[PDB]
Amino acid sequence: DVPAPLTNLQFKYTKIFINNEWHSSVSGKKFPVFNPATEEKLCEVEEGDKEDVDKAVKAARQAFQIGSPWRTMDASERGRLLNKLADLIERDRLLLATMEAMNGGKLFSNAYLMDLGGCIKTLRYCAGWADKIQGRTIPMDGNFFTYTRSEPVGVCGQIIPWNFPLLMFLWKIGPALSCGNTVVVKPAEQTPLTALHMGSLIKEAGFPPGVVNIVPGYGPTAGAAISSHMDVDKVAFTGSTEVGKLIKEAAGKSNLKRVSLELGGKSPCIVFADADLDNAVEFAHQGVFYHQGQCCIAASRLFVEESIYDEFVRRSVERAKKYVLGNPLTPGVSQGPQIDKEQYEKILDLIESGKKEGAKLECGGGPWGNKGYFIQPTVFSDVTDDMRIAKEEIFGPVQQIMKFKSLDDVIKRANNTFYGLSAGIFTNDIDKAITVSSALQSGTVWVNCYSVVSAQCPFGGFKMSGNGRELGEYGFHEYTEVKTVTIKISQKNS
Amino acid sequence: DVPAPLTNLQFKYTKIFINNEWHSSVSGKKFPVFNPATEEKLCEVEEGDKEDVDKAVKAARQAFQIGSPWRTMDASERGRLLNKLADLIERDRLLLATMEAMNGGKLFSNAYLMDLGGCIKTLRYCAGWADKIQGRTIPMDGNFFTYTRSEPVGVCGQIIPWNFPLLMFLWKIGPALSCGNTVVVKPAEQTPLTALHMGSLIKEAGFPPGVVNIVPGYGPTAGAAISSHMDVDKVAFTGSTEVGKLIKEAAGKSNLKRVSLELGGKSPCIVFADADLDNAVEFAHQGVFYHQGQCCIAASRLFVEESIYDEFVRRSVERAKKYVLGNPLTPGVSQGPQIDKEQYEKILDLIESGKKEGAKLECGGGPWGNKGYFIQPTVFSDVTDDMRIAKEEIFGPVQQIMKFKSLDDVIKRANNTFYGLSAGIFTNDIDKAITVSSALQSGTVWVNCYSVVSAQCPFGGFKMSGNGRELGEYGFHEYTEVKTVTIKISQKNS
Amino acid sequence: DVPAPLTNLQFKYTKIFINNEWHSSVSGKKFPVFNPATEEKLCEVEEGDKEDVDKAVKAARQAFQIGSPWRTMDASERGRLLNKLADLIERDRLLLATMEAMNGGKLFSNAYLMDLGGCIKTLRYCAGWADKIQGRTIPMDGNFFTYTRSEPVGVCGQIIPWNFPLLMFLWKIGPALSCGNTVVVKPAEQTPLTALHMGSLIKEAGFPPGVVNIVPGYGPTAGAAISSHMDVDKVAFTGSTEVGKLIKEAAGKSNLKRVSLELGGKSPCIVFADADLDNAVEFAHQGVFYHQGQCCIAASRLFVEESIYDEFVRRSVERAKKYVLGNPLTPGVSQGPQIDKEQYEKILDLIESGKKEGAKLECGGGPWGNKGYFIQPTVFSDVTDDMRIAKEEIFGPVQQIMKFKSLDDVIKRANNTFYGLSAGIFTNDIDKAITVSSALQSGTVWVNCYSVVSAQCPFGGFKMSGNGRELGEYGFHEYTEVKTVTIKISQKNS
Amino acid sequence: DVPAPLTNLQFKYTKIFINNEWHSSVSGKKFPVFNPATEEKLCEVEEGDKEDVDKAVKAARQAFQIGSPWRTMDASERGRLLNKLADLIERDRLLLATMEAMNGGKLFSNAYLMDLGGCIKTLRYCAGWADKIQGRTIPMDGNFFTYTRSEPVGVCGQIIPWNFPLLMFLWKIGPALSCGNTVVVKPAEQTPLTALHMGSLIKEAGFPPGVVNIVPGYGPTAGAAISSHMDVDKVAFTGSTEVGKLIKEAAGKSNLKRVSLELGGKSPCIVFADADLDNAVEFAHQGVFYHQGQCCIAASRLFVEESIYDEFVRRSVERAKKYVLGNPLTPGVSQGPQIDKEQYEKILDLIESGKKEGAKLECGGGPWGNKGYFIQPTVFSDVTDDMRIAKEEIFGPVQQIMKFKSLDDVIKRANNTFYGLSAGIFTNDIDKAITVSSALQSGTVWVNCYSVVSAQCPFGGFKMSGNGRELGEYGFHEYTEVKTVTIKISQKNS
Ligand SMILES: NC(=O)c1ccc[n+]([C@@H]2O[C@H](COP(=O)([O-])OP(=O)(O)OC[C@H]3O[C@@H](n4cnc5c(N)ncnc54)[C@H](O)[C@@H]3O)[C@@H](O)[C@H]2O)c1
């Protein structure tokens, strides 16, 4: 029961957000923001660059000064503000969902129920942690009194992707602000709109100027200025592993700022013969095709045991033929477009390599329509580990299905990749559930389900799928800087 | 009451330690290890390089495989082994202390009571944490059972400095092994001897082969091979901020391995007029001059309030004249040599700059002796913030004394640096103790004391003085990799 | 800036709250509820007894059954409901404050700003903890998978006092519900009104029937039925140590239910000569006289160092003469009446004993008015430890001032009591602040302040001032029951 | 591979242990200690009573004074002492195991490998926690600095049972001492010998006098003096629920001391048709018969699903016939005697009631031998919930086997008891493993195994099976007393 999407939305927030005020780009330049499904320009946004980032950083630095409103404020007041922001997102839910679907080529019903719902739940979760961030009193040797302070890291630059614009935005600012940090968020050049709208909500909630600064623009420009900035204490990034590498290097060549990364993946999904077949097929299906396959945790490597392999493929191909491509804002459409032309052509090149390397094409395998960047739901069987589509992150509606015999070889193959964001295991065996999930080198491992991500759960990947964890209890520790204070006393007592 | 140092020590362990076996360098090359105080060659050690590192990493990777002895072993057994290693250090305390003093130009009584004592205490502390590393069960949304596993990070490459050879060695392997990791330690080319001896103790304690691999050699060679290795999950480094930068970059250009850094500093030591003057002078003195000023936390910026400034200088110069330079193994000597020629000339160049920039030379200010790299205990007053000796880490027996008037300006000046490892505050005012220590941007802040570092306390710096914390409860989290396991269940209950 | 109190308040909720429905007492009996200041009857409330308690317990037991709405509900939804209840208290803030002031003889401005403000803040704090109550995964010996569940304790009977009716009510249900427990609250017979009003707000917020059951009535009847009930898993009590004893015994003679107690006190307040005199006098004043001295943490033993003793007494008597007794609802009145006649006569008898035992009467020392139970702000100097007013909890506007010479004897005297709820220390000496507070046997120790109680802080007393802690992180653990689940697995891995 | 037990053991420690010195009972009286298997007197021990307890408490109080050796000592030194005590138990392992088997009628091989092994592991676990007991720094509202201290509870009286003498002894003193408490242990009158021997080991390890005081004697005398003592801050008890009630009452009538209880049980063991039958039969067998059925967690209610019921009973009767009764010190004997005559006659009366109420006698059902208190391994099938042997704790080699059909009714029946110490679930179904264990009201729930208790796991029961948890992280919090210290500061910063 989702309301009707808005049609005539007029855009209001298109500028750079610094100190709760709207600024034009120092350069004067602007960049176009389009609708993925129709290719028509939604509006133009100020093009932030290095000089715009420098202004944002100084504002964030000033807001983090000892004695400033944001730092003397009660931790509980910090939580109340986050909850108030969630209230404003709840109010503007329809507008944000429509805007999100329009700019991101995202299905509206999902944007309204899933994305916006997660946005609200994440903020409310973060709100609760604010006055619960605690330090320790340590019984060290000698006559001393020692305690620690879980202080904020400081000025946090946060660079986010285009697949879940608003959600990624709140995933970053939620924990950061809950801990007392000041941020400089740089949204993807493809989807800055919902992020900019949040600026007005952040100002309306009552957050002190400089606590949240938003600088729209491109990556090599505004993003790089953040990663290499000498006054940014930490950079949080979510996107391609290729850029993630550049971020960590930039951090090293400059200020040695803390770095947290959430990169892509090539998540394996192992289905054993003793598993519930129906359950496995549906979860494995959604696991790869959700949001036109543009998910970090996409189950791009589906390992199925020989005895149930042929059958599993039949249902997978069957299930993949039940899609209606079109405008994500139009009722009935069950699959929208890819974000842009670059992404669209990347998926086609990979599909083509799959064909050329002997992969068995079951579904689609080509483009669709003449307006927008659509791709037919593609399925490939008899996919081998050495294949290009089995190694590289496609980030498109393309499913890979492999065959396995032994428990040991399938685990080895599942772990043979530089990625390790997530994985799925389907079995009704208690032992395989526990031991196999312990053996897989992935940040999150789902058993008899998939894609289940929650606010109270830490999320991140092993190996090259990222550094650190987000959300949950552990995620909040990534946004604090520990300080040990040791005081000499006459005589200590237990 | 310290025993007499050994004289004829014969060296036994000079090879590369891989899989509990001793290997010659693949290249065949060896490098000389000298005695800082006399300049005479102690012996020669195998020169490890990239090919030697590759062997060590594969051994560490093999020891970390699912089902291997080290990973199936009880966490409690892991602690018992660490305690057994401490027992062996306790037994070989005299040998290790003598060897440490000889190779590092370190005063024997200190090496025996302080360094070796800290070595034992650190291992015993780590031992206790082993079976106490726990995960969580998270009450997430929906019908799911979710729990986390605090798994080891994996293969950890650890690069350590020459100022506290054995202590740095155990500071790294202690937490790592306590958590279940396998390591590849690369000691400083100047001081590999005590580290190599530990190899025999690690094998004798009963640790499975491959758990600890030690590869002596140079930095740009063996060290760089570790930081850029594609199969190393994490690199832990302690040394210069210059190399720290290279480490983080290498980690980015290659595998995106986790990085923890403990770099130098320029620790400010603020003394207010209301402080206990005697206490302040002694702590501030030891804080800069300990181990010939070769400490990461050296209080190289002593800010004293005007009203007590002149008097403080007098006592400081007075105290600095009570030193006997000479062989650290000879009774009566209260100050040994610097590690090598490079370090010695770095200190002289900085002393010289202090003279040329108008700093007031109170003590020494020049070299000493003809055998070894000794330097006279130097003291400078009327030092200004812009001075080279007030900005760069000297790492030599050179003290800087500054003057301050206001509480706000002194805090600003204390924080105006890219460093932030530690700081000291001397005052009898409850409010300044708490508020000023909260305002200083340093990892550890001592009040009415200094240099007090303990095993149960997390240690690391803000800004460019490092990433992450070592030891203590927080330090052990830096050696784990969190995994979230979500299981679909029929119905959840609180 | 507090709004004008309501005058004609008509009462609506006067029945027993069970399963979100209003019930008449099974016996048919009712009991009168009066206004402390005027002695006039506000209304009549159903007199709950054992049979009414049995109905409430069965309702709470049914709401706690596996599979019931309250137990399958998301922990986050549990938090959202608590925040919604706080929203309803915010809305009915004027009504609750007026009603509280009328029924409790409590000053309106305080009831509106302090009591109701604390009510809201406590609920919001509890709300945040709901989905953050986590268990552990334990690396035990052998091949097993072990994790714990922090389950709710179950049916919690909560008996509260009359001095802070609404606040005590939320202090109990907040943590309990946040953790998933079902409760049976039994408010003081003198002040059931605001608690009953909360019933309607609890039903309106959306809490499942049976989660909160409120049974007004007397102590030896309804209260005793709760403490000795065979199906109540835990009893939380706040009141006199005399009844606390009976509660623990009842728990032993019956079901061996968990017991938490927050009893009275005789809180010492030590003022050293080096302390800020003004600060000390004001805090020490409010510490004893707040809410007509009817506070658990009342600083009923003020130890002042000889050198500043005479001067301290002058200001204390001076400050105590600035009060206007009258109706707590009338502007200008700075001191309301005692709760009832029993309490009034208890305070007089103690005041009389103070005079008879040689205590130096500085202020009042007698009753006031003819309508209501008022008492003149009394102050006594030269009070000795053996005096009755220096040993027993007065719970009235009566301050005791003592003299001390040595640091050791004052600590011994401060600890020489069966109480130990709280204490205060006034000094500008860093060492006395830390070491003396460590030496005092009190649950909460304030330094240079007093009466500062917050939601994020655990509160409880040492010795006979109570068992367990309330609020804060530790307080929430008192509302959970740990369960260890050990599963046999083929092979364990770290 | 267990060594031969000792034969001529001469007893040395038979007095009351106070202040590391051996005292005769104030009364002069002594009591005989026998060998359960032969009925011959091993020796005589001083009979401690109230006056002996008063001396022990004063010694423990004196050792806990601020500034005493035990309280100023480093937490790490406290751990080192515990590990040293474990070293001494390791050394005297043969003596303690022999002595334990002789005094407790315990099989020697088990006493040597299981009991003594657990003794050592528990101490080593506790040792590690000592310097890791930490407090918090709380970000409360307003300008204040707040931190907590996890102080020791104080003087802890500990009363232990006769079934696992030495193990219970260390289970109590381990955590207590690790946290800094001083204790007054009162071992069972039937088995004081190994506890008294520990006194010499505690003195030899270097523990300060008064830290551990041991007062042998009877329950209504020495034990009751501890539970009702006015200067004991906490009483820890393990034994019958009947005495547990008296302990909690005594605590209420006197000082309101904290109380922790570990009482008996009637642990249900549910076996579903889909479980591994062999595994289930063996675990369930050891679960009831271990140590002649004298275990708190004995699986005295074995629920087996109808479809596999008859078959399960055959194997259970089969397995129960493979026992050789005799002296626990003699090779080949696989079942020793009950502790004494009282216990022996309690088991017979229950066996008899089983016969009279229609239970189907499969095995034994009567006594054995003429020297000692032996009983034949008894098994009963077709046992109904209303039967006396299905409700009361037998504490003898008697197994009850029931039949069940539905998942819901079996859980209801498993929970229909005032006990709730532990439970066992056998099934290969992932869902039943998780959901059923969540639904059972027992402190510990084993899946596909049983009797697996470890040091790093918290242990305690729901309902009348006890209060609080022992061992593990949570268990150590039961041995601390939280203190909140709030300091007023000029301005707070996050
Ligand atoms: N933080 C500390 O405790 C500490 C310790 C030693 C040195 N320093 C500082 O650094 C200055 C110079 O000392 P240094 O050159 O011996 O220190 P360094 O940082 O070069 O040496 C530390 C360690 O890192 C290795 N290393 C060096 N080059 C490397 C490279 N390219 N890649 C990977 N690893 C490499 C070394 O071989 C050694 O094991 C000093 O004057 C002082 O300021 C600080």
> What separation in angstroms does the CA of D211 have from each of B68, C277, C290?
43, 42, 42
In terms of CA atoms, which chain A residue is nearest residue B452?
A486
Q: Where are the alpha helices (DSSP H) in B64-192?
A: 69-72, 75-91, 93-104, 108-110, 116-129, 165-178
Q: DSSP code of C425?
A: E
What type of residue sits at position C21?
Answer: E
What is the rounded distance in angstroms from the CA atom of residue B391 to the CA atom of residue B394? Answer: 9
Cβ distance of A135 and D148 shorter than 8 Å: no
Give first-to-last CA distance, chain B, whole Å.
Answer: 60
Q: Which of D281, D325, D266 is nearest to D37 (CA)?
A: D325
Cβ distance of A477 and B473 shorter than 8 Å: no
Domain B2-264+455-494 homologous superfamily, CATH: Aldehyde Dehydrogenase; Chain A, domain 1 (3.40.605.10)
Q: Which residues, other chains included, contact A457 with Cβ-Cβ below 8 Å and sequence gap of 6+?
A: A444, A471, A472, B138, B140, B146, B484, B486
**Would you state the structure tokens that stand for residue D482, as one six-digit string?**
């939280």
What's the residue count for chain B?
A: 494
The residues that bridge with D40 in the sheet, in sequence order, are none
Selected for mutation to probe chain B from A120, A133, A482, A492 (highest B CB count within 10 Å) is: A482
> Long-range CB contacts (< 8 A, 24+ apart) of B381-389?
B381/B313, B382/B358, B383/B301, B383/B354, B383/B359, B384/B358, B384/B359, B385/B413, B385/B416, B387/B353, B387/B354, B387/B357, B387/B358, B387/B359, B388/B350, B388/B353, B388/B354, B388/B357, B389/B350, B389/B351, B389/B353, B389/B354, B389/B357, B389/B359
Give the max Cα distance, chain A: 81
What is the rounded distance in angstroms from the CA atom of residue C382 to the CA atom of residue C359? Answer: 6
What is the rounded distance in angstroms from the CA atom of residue C227 to the CA atom of residue C247? Answer: 6
Chain A within 8 Å of D76 (Cβ-Cβ)? yes
What is the rounded distance in angstroms from the CA atom of residue A171 to the CA atom of residue A169? Answer: 6
Cβ distance of B132 and D127 shorter than 8 Å: no
What is the rounded distance in angstroms from the CA atom of residue D198 to the CA atom of residue D96? Answer: 9
- Residue C442: phi, psi to the nearest 5? -140, 145
What type of residue sits at position D156?
Answer: C
Closest residue by CA, ligand 1 atom 5: B239
Closest residue by CA, ligand 1 atom 6: B239
Chain C within 8 Å of B137 (Cβ-Cβ)? yes
Q: Are strands D135-138 and A135-138 parallel, antiparallel or unpaired?
A: antiparallel
| Four-CA torsion B197, B200, B205, B206, nearest 10 degrees | 150
D264 is in an annotated binding site: yes
Q: Are C264 and C295 in contact (CB under 8 A)?
A: no
**Would you state the structure tokens that stand for residue B194, as one six-digit string?**
């005590």
The residues that bridge with A34 in the sheet, in sequence order, are A41
Backbone Cα Rg of chain C: 23
- Residue B119: phi, psi to the nearest 5? -60, -50
**After what residues is chain B interrupted, C–N > 2.5 A?**
none
Q: Are C286 and C299 in contact (CB under 8 A)?
A: no
What ligand 1 atom has the least distance to the C-alpha of B242? 19
- Angle formed at CA A150 by CA A144 and CA A154, multiple of 5 degrees: 130
Q: In this complex, which chains have at least 3 CB pairs below 8 Å with chain C?
A: A, B, D
The single residue listed with the structure tokens 């200025």 is A225
Chain A residues within an 8 Å CB radius of C434: 145, 487, 489
The preferred substitution site among B228, B243, B343, B349 for testing ligand 1, maximizing ligand atoms within 8 Å of CB, is B243
What is the rounded distance in angstroms from the CA atom of residue A87 to the CA atom of residue A123? Answer: 10
What is the rounded distance in angstroms from the CA atom of residue D135 to the CA atom of residue D147? Answer: 7
- Residue D354: phi, psi to the nearest 5? -65, -45
Give first-to-last CA distance, chain A, whole Å.
Answer: 60
SS3 A356: helix
The single residue listed with the structure tokens 């203190």 is D483
D425 is in an annotated binding site: no
Q: Which residues, other chains included, contact A350 with Cβ-Cβ below 8 Å and sequence gap of 6+?
A: A388, A389, A392, A394, A396, A398
Chain A residues within an 8 Å CB radius of C439: 493
Indicate whether residue B238 lines ligand 1 (CB < 6 A): yes
Q: Are B400 and B378 in contact (CB under 8 A)?
A: no
Q: Would you call A296 a catalytic residue per the annotation?
A: yes
- The number of C-beta contacts closer than 8 angstroms across A and C is 71
- The number of C-beta contacts closer than 8 angstroms across C and D is 194
Q: Which residues, other chains included, contact C72 with Cβ-Cβ below 8 Å and sequence gap of 6+?
A: B491, B492, B493, B494
What is the rounded distance in angstroms from the CA atom of residue A44 to the CA atom of residue A28? Answer: 12
Q: Would you call C296 a catalytic residue per the annotation?
A: yes
The residues that bridge with D487 in the sheet, in sequence order, are C447, D145
Closest residue by CA, ligand 1 atom 25: B219
String of DSSP letters for B178-219: HTT-EEEEE--TT--HHHHHHHHHHHHHTPPTTSEEE--B-I
> Long-range CB contacts (< 8 A, 24+ apart) of D490-493?
D490/B431, D490/B435, D490/D143, D491/A67, D491/A72, D491/B435, D491/D143, D492/A72, D492/B438, D492/D142, D492/D143, D492/D144, D492/D145, D493/A66, D493/A67, D493/A71, D493/A72, D493/A151, D493/B435, D493/B438, D493/B439
Chain D within 8 Å of B430 (Cβ-Cβ)? yes
What is the rounded distance in angstroms from the CA atom of residue C165 to the CA atom of residue A312? Answer: 64
Q: Which residues, other chains included, contact B183 with Cβ-Cβ below 8 Å and sequence gap of 6+?
A: B60, B155, B156, B157, B158, B172, B173, B176, B177, B211, B212, B213
Q: Are D479 and D151 in contact (CB under 8 A)?
A: no
Chain B within 8 Å of A4 (Cβ-Cβ)? no
Q: How far is CA B276 from the centre of its chain?
A: 30
**Would you state the structure tokens that stand for residue D264, as one six-digit string?**
């008996």
Q: Which of D163, D71, D73 is nearest to D111 (CA)?
A: D163
> 3-state DSSP helix/strand/coil percent for chain D, to nearest 5?
40, 20, 40
What is the rounded distance in angstroms from the CA atom of residue C158 to the CA atom of residue C98? Answer: 24
**Would you state the structure tokens that stand for residue B205, as one six-digit string?**
């304690």
What is the rounded distance in angstroms from the CA atom of residue B185 to the CA atom of residue B226? Answer: 9
Q: Are D78 and D116 in contact (CB under 8 A)?
A: no
Method: X-ray
- Angle formed at CA A417 by CA A412 and CA A419, multiple of 5 degrees: 125
What is the rounded distance in angstroms from the CA atom of residue A460 to the CA atom of residue A466? Answer: 6
Query: b vs e for D5-28, b when ≥16 Cβ sit within 10 Å of the residue's Cβ?
Result: bbeeeeeebbbbbbbbebbebbee
Chain C within 8 Å of A131 (Cβ-Cβ)? yes
Chain A within 8 Å of B321 (Cβ-Cβ)? no
Q: Are A31 and A45 in contact (CB under 8 A)?
A: yes
Cβ distance of A140 and B456 shorter than 8 Å: yes
Cβ distance of C485 and D447 shorter than 8 Å: yes
Q: Which residues, other chains included, contact B405 with Cβ-Cβ below 8 Å and sequence gap of 6+?
A: B305, B306
SS3 A331: coil
Q: Are B399 and B233 in contact (CB under 8 A)?
A: no
Angle of helix C241-253 relative to helix D241-253, nearest 10 degrees, comes to 170
Backbone Cα Rg of chain D: 23
| Active-site residue set of B | 262, 296
CATH level 3 topology of A265-454? Aldehyde Dehydrogenase; Chain A, domain 2 (3.40.309)
Q: What Å resolution does this PDB entry report?
A: 2.3
Selected for mutation to probe chain C from D144, D465, D484 (highest C CB count within 10 Å) is: D484
Closest residue by CA, ligand 1 atom 11: B240
Q: Are B350 and B361 in contact (CB under 8 A)?
A: no
| Four-CA torsion D394, D398, D404, D410, nearest 10 degrees | 30
Closest residue by CA, ligand 1 atom 7: B239
What is the rounded distance in angstroms from the CA atom of residue A106 to the CA atom of residue A484? Answer: 47
The single residue listed with the structure tokens 């990892």 is B443
The single residue listed with the structure tokens 């001897």 is B193
| CB atoms inside a 10 Å sphere around CB A1 | 3
Shortest alpha-carbon distance between residue C240 and chain D (Å): 12
SS3 B261: strand
Q: Which of A337, C428, A183, C148 is nearest to D444 (CA)?
A: C148
What type of residue sits at position C266?
Answer: K
What is the rounded distance in angstroms from the CA atom of residue A208 to the CA atom of residue D260? Answer: 49
Sheet holding C466-467, edge to edge: C21-23, C16-18, C212-214, C182-186, C155-159, C234-238, C258-262, C466-467
Q: Which of B467, B481, B93, B2 is nearest to B245 (CA)?
A: B467
C356 CB burial (10 A radius; 0-12, 13-18, 19+): exposed
Q: Are C440 and C415 in contact (CB under 8 A)?
A: yes
Q: Return the domain boundaries, chain D.
A: 2-264+455-494, 265-454
The single residue listed with the structure tokens 């079934």 is D163
What is the rounded distance in angstroms from the CA atom of residue A395 to the CA atom of residue B42? Answer: 59
Chain A within 8 Å of C309 (Cβ-Cβ)? no
Q: Which residues, other chains included, contact A97 with Cβ-Cβ below 8 Å and sequence gap of 6+?
A: A5, A108, A111, A112, A115, A116
The residues that bridge with B270 in the sheet, in sequence order, are B303, B425
What is the rounded distance in angstroms from the CA atom of residue D383 to the CA atom of residue D360? Answer: 7
The single residue listed with the structure tokens 């600590």 is C411
Q: Which of B181, B75, B172, B78 is nearest to B133 (CA)?
A: B75
Q: Which of D262, D309, D257, D259 is nearest to D281 (CA)?
A: D309
In terms of CA atoms, which chain A residue is nearest residue D179?
A494
Q: Which of B209, B420, B249, B315 is nearest to A254 (CA)?
A: B249
